[PDB]
Ligand binder design. Structure first.
Ligand SMILES: O=P(O)(O)OC[C@@H](O)CO
Ligand SMILES: O=P(O)(O)OC[C@@H](O)CO
Ligand SMILES: O=P(O)(O)OC[C@@H](O)CO
Ligand SMILES: O=P(O)(O)OC[C@@H](O)CO
Ligand code: NA
Ligand code: NA
Ligand code: NA
Ligand code: NA
Ligand SMILES: [Zn+2]
Ligand SMILES: [Zn+2]
Ligand SMILES: [Zn+2]
Ligand SMILES: [Zn+2]
Ligand SMILES: [Zn+2]
Ligand SMILES: [Zn+2]
Ligand SMILES: [Zn+2]
Ligand SMILES: [Zn+2]
Lengths: 334, 334, 334, 334
C-alpha cells in the first residue's frame, strides 16, 4: 500500500532506531514508478518514490508542462499501483526553491489539507523545501511556517541546509539554528538534508569526497543544545547525491542518523542501459532500412521498456541492500 | 477535458453526420498517453485513448501484471492530464475476448456503475467486447447483455463481427443479426468493428487488400431491415488495423460510416524512432565505454522520451488530418 | 590474370562489337581490390579496377599521402592477386586534372615506358586525362601528346569532354574536334568520357536526368566526319557516375557505344553496409562496456571486413549483369 | 625502407645489447600495414610487420584463400610503402605448424632463395616455424634443417618451445636441447619463442599470470652449456601474446633478452574502435533509412578507415614506448 502518515512516521522511526535508511527513488513516469515499487517489493523493503520539479513537469507532458498537474497525475497513478504490493510506499516531492513554492509545494499541500479536512490521508507523505540558496534565517523562517502547515496535513517536511553540488559543508551554527527554530520533532517531524560534500550525478569513483563526520558533529551540536546524552541522534538526516557513492561512505552515513538516501542518476543509467542495447541489437527492426518496414515486435515500446523496468528494479534492490532496509518492510511479509 | 458520456455521444454523432472519424490511439504509459492527447490538441481535434489487455497489463508493472489495475491506474492518470487540454478525450478499452471478460471488461464496468450510482460519470466512456472468435449468435447474446449493462453505466459498447488479421470479411447474415439483436442505437449506442480485410500491423504498402464495399453493403442490409432509405447509415463502424493504410482506403471507409479508426503500430514506430536515433548518436554517453562513466544528460530517460513523445504526437496529428477530425473539436477552440 | 595490352584491346573491341560494357570499379585497398576481382570472377566476366587520385593517396597511408606510391603499391598487390583468377583484370587510373598530371599520370606512364623498354608490359593498362576544366583545344592538345606517350607504352588513354556533375552535356563541336585531333584509333586507342547529364554519387532515383541521345549524336557526327555509314560507332564511350542509374538508362547507353561504366558510390555502400550491421549487432563486443574487455572475435577487423568484401563482390556481379559482360570473359572458363 | 638482412640483424643485436625490443604487429591488409608503419615512424622506431596464416589467407581474398598468395601480395605492397619511410621495417611470417610448412614457409623460403640467387634480398626477413605441438626432438630436427635453408636465403628463423595459450611453461631440458641442436647464432641467427605463461588475446588485467623468471633461467641454462659467464644472454627471445600485458611484465621480460614482442589483439581493438564509433554517430548516413538514400561522405570506406588507421598507429607508438625502441631507429632520423 501507499504509506499512511502513521506508517511513514513508524518507518522513519524504525530506520533511525536501527541505523538503516530507505532509498528515495526519483521517478518521472508510469514505467519508472512501476520499476521502483517492484524493486522495493523484490527487496522485501518499504521505500520512497519522489518527483522533482522537472520530473513532475515531464510527467505532465509537453503540452501541459505544469508541476502540480504532473505530480498529481503521477501520484494518482502510484496510489492505484501501490495498493497491489505488500510493502509500504511513501510519496515525496524533491527540491523546491523559494520561487517555485507557490507553484509546487504550496498547492500540493493545499490539496492534501483538503483531503485531511474530509477525513482522508494526504496525497503525498512528505514535501521538500529547499531553502539552501537563501540566508539560513530566511530558510528557517519559511521552514517553520511550512512545518506547521505540513504537520496539520499529516505530512513530513524535508528541509536543506548547505548546497548539494552538481560551502558543501553545513556549519555548526546552522545545525543549532535548526534545532532552535524547529525543535526535534515535537512540533512536527522534519527530515534534514544537511550537506557534507554530496554531489548530484555520478563521477569517476575517486572524485567526490564525502565528509560524514559533519553529520556526526551536527548530532552532537543538537544533543548539546537539547541537553541530551552525547550519543543522541536528534536529527533524521537525508543523504542527497546517493548515486556513485562507495558502500563504505553509505555505511558511515547510516551510523550518524541518515534515514533517507536519494538516488536518481544510477537508476537512470539502469533504466536506459538495456534500451540502448535493444536498439543496437535490433537496429534493422527499430529502423526502416533499405526499403524494409522494420519489425513491430521490437519497435513496440513495451519490448524494450519491460527490460528498462526490470533493470531499474534490480538497481533499486541493490539500494535496499546498501541501505540495510531490505527484508525489513513493516508489513512483515517474509 | 475527459469526454463526458453526452459529449462522446455528440462527438460520434457529429463525425457520422459529417463523414469524418476519430483516431483511437493505443497507449501503454504516461508518456504515450501524454503524446496522444498533445497530438489531438495540436490538431484542434477530439480523440480516443484506448488500452488493450496487454497494454493494461504492461501499465500495471511486471510486479502486478493485472489488467484492471493497469487500466484503472492509466485511466486515473489520464483524467488528471486531460483536464488541462481544451479538447475532449475519450477513454476506451480494446479487444476483450470471452475468457477475459471476467477479468477486464466486467470489473471495469462495475467500477463505472458504482461511480454512476453516486451521481458521477463512468471511468471509461466505451469498452470493447470482441466476440469474433465465437459463433455469431453467442457473440450477440453476450453483446445484448453487455449493451444493457454499458448503457446503464453511460458507456458505449464496441463489438466485433469477423476477425481482424495479424473470413476477414463480415457476412450479410451477420450484419442482419446485429441489427435484429441490438437495434440501431435506441437500446444504447454501440460501435461495430465489422471486418473488411483489415490487418493489425504494418506490411509493405502493397500487401493488405481492404474491401470497404463490405461496409457499404452492411449499411444497405441494415437500412433495408429497418425500412430506411437505401442511403441511410444505421451502423457506426470501427476501422481496426489502421496503421499502414493508404489515404484512399481511409477516405473510402469514411464514406461508409466509419467513425473510429484504431491506430497502434504506426504510433509505436513514431515513438521508438527517435529513441533509436538518440542511442546511436549518443552511444558513448548511454554506455559506459573504455573505463568512462557515460553522460547523465543523455542517459536521463527524459532526454530521449521527450523526443519519443513529440514524434508520436506528430503521427497523431497526421491521423487527425487523414480522418478529417482535425480542426473540429466540439469545444470550438480555434 | 592481369589483362595484357592485347587482351585489354580485344576486351574493349568485343564489348563494342556486341554492345556490352565492363564495370570499372574504384578501389582503395587490398580488401576492395579483392572484392572487385571476386565479383568479376563470380560473374564469369572480365573487368577493370581503377584508382582515383584520392584513392591512391589513401592507399599510400596517412604517413605518405603520395598518389604515385599508393597507385604503384595497390597495382603491385593487384598483379599478385589477379594471377590467381581465370578472368582478365585491367588496371586504370581515374580523373587526373591538369595540375596533377606531373604527380600522377606522367610518372606512372614513365614507370610503364621503362617496363616496356625492358620487354615487359605496362603496370596499368589505361590512364585517364581529365581535361574537361580547360578549353577544348588545350584539353585535346594535351590529349594528343599523352596519347602518343600512352600508345608507345602499350596503354589506352581515357579522356573527358564535358563535366561530370557532383554544360553536362557534350557539344557537337567537341565531338568533331576530338575525331580531328586524335582520329578513331589508328593513332592509338582512346576511350571517351563524353558527358550526357551524368552525376557522380547517388540521389533519389528520380533526380538525375540522363540524355543518352547525346552519345548517339556524337557517333553520327564522328561517322560523318570520317565518311562512314550513319550507324557506325567511331567512339568507345565511358559512362561516369554509374551508381544509382536506372537499368533502362544503362541499356540505352550500351546501344550507343559505351564500353566502360564507372562505379564507386554503390560499391561503397555495399562494402560499408554489413560493417554497419556488424557494429550494431555486436555493440558490446566491439566496445569495452561496463568494465568488460570486449570480444576479440568480433573486433578482429577480418570478422566484419570479410562480410564487407562479399557484399561489395555481390554488387560487382550485379554491375556485370547490368552491363551484359557477365558470362563473357575472354578466357572462356564456363 | 624495408630492413635489409644486415640491418635486421643489426636491429636485433642492438636491441639485445641495450635490453630493448621491437613490436611485431600482425597485419592483414593495406590499411593495417599502413597503420603499423606510420606507428613505427611516429615513434622514431624500427619495427616488424608480420602475417599469420589466417592473415595471409584473408589478404588473398575470399576468392583465392591461399596463404602464399596473400603473404606475397601484402609483402609486395609493403615493399613499395616502406621505401617512403625513414625507419627500417622487417617482414615476418607468424606461427606455422608442421602441416602448413609445405604451403606457407617452405614456398616463401624458396621465393627468397631465388631472389638471393639473382643477387637480391629475401622477400621476408624472418619466418616462424612453430613446432611446439610436436615432441621437442622432432621440433628441433625440423628447426635445424629450416635454419640452414633460412640462413642461406639471408633470413632469420623464429622457433617455438612450449605452447602459447588461447605446459605454458618451457622446461630446462628444452632450453638445453635448443642450444645443442642450433648453437647460439654461429650457424645462423634464430629467435626463440620460449613460453612463460603467455596467452594470445586480452583478458581482464588480473587473469594472465606471466613467469618471466623462466626466461632468466633459460639464459642461465644456455650460458652454462656454452661455458659463458652466468649473466650472458645467449637467446634472443620472442614474447608472444603481448596484448593486455602489464608494463611491469614487459619491463621484466626485456631484462631477460626479449627482442621481439608480438601484438595483435590490442591493435585490432584500436583499429575497430573508431569504426564502431563512426557507424553509431552516422547511423542514418551509413544506413538507407525511412526511404532516404544514406550519405556518401560517411559510407565512403575511407571516411572511417582513415580513423581506424590513425588509432591503430597510436597503439603502435604506445608499443614502441613500452618496449623502449621508440626514438632508436638505426637510420638516426631525429
Ligand atoms: O531535477 P531532476 O529531475 O534532474 O532531479 C533532481 C534531483 O535528482 C537532484 O537535484
Ligand atoms: O495487444 P496489443 O497491446 O499488442 O494491441 C492490440 C491491438 O493494437 C490489436 O489487437
Ligand atoms: O575522388 P574519389 O576517390 O572520391 O573517386 C572519384 C570518382 O569516383 C569520381 O570523381
Ligand atoms: O591467427 P590469427 O590471424 O588470429 O593471428 C595469430 C596470432 O596473433 C596468434 O596466434
Ligand atoms: Na551522486
Ligand atoms: Na494495419
Ligand atoms: Na551516380
Ligand atoms: Na595477450
Ligand atoms: Zn537532491
Ligand atoms: Zn518481520
Ligand atoms: Zn484491433
Ligand atoms: Zn468551431
Ligand atoms: Zn568519374
Ligand atoms: Zn565462351
Ligand atoms: Zn603468437
Ligand atoms: Zn640517433
Amino acid at each position: 500500500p501507499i504509506a499512511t502518515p502513521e506508517v511513514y512516521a513508524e518507518m522513519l522511526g524504525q530506520a533511525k532506531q536501527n541505523s538503516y535508511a530507505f532509498p528515495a527513488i526519483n521517478c518521472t513516469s508510469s514505467e519508472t514508478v512501476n520499476a521502483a515499487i517492484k524493486g522495493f517489493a523484490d527487496a522485501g523493503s518499504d521505500g520512497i518514490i519522489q518527483f522533482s520539479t522537472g520530473g513532475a513537469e515531464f510527467g505532465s507532458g509537453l503540452g501541459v508542462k505544469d508541476m502540480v498537474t504532473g505530480a498529481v497525475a503521477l501520484a494518482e497513478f502510484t496510489h492505484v499501483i501501490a495498493a497491489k504490493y505488500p510493502v509500504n510506499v511513501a510519496l515525496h516531492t524533491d527540491h523546491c526553491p523559494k520561487d517555485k513554492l507557490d507553484s509546487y509545494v504550496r498547492p500540493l499541500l493545499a490539496i492534501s489539507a483538503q483531503r485531511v479536512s474530509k477525513g482522508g490521508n494526504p496525497l503525498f507523505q512528505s514535501h521538500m523545501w529547499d531553502g539552501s540558496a537563501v540566508p539560513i534565517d530566511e530558510n528557517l523562517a519559511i521552514a517553520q511556517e511550512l512545518l506547521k502547515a505540513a504537520a496539520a496535513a499529516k505530512i513530513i517536511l524535508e528541509i536543506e541546509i548547505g548546497v548539494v553540488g552538481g560551502k558543501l559543508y553545513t556549519s555548526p551554527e546552522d545545525f543549532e539554528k535548526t534545532i532552535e527554530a524547529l525543535g526535534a520533532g515535537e512540533h512536527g517531524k522534519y527530515l534534514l538534508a544537511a550537506t557534507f560534500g554530496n554531489v548530484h550525478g555520478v563521477y569517476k569513483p575517486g572524485n567526490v569526497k564525502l565528509r560524514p563526520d559533519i553529520l556526526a558533529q551536527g548530532q552532537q551540536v543538537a544533543a548539546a543544545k537539547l541537553g541530551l546524552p552525547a550519543d543522541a541522534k536528534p536529527f533524521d538526516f537525508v543523504f542527497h547525491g546517493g548515486s556513485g557513492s562507495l558502500k563504505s561512505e553509505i555505511e558511515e552515513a547510516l551510523r550518524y542518523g541518515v534515514v533517507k538516501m536519494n538516488v536518481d542518476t544510477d537508476t537512470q543509467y539502469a533504466f536506459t542501459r538495456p534500451i540502448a542495447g535493444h536498439m543496437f541489437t535490433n537496429y534493422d527492426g527499430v529502423l526502416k532500412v533499405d526499403g524494409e518496414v522494420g519489425v513491430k515486435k521490437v519497435y513496440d515500446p513495451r519490448s524494450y521498456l519491460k527490460k528498462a523496468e526490470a533493470s531499474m528494479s534490480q538497481r533499486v534492490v541493490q539500494a535496499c541492500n546498501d541501505l540495510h532496509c531490505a527484508g525489513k518492510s513493516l508489513t512483515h511479509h517474509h
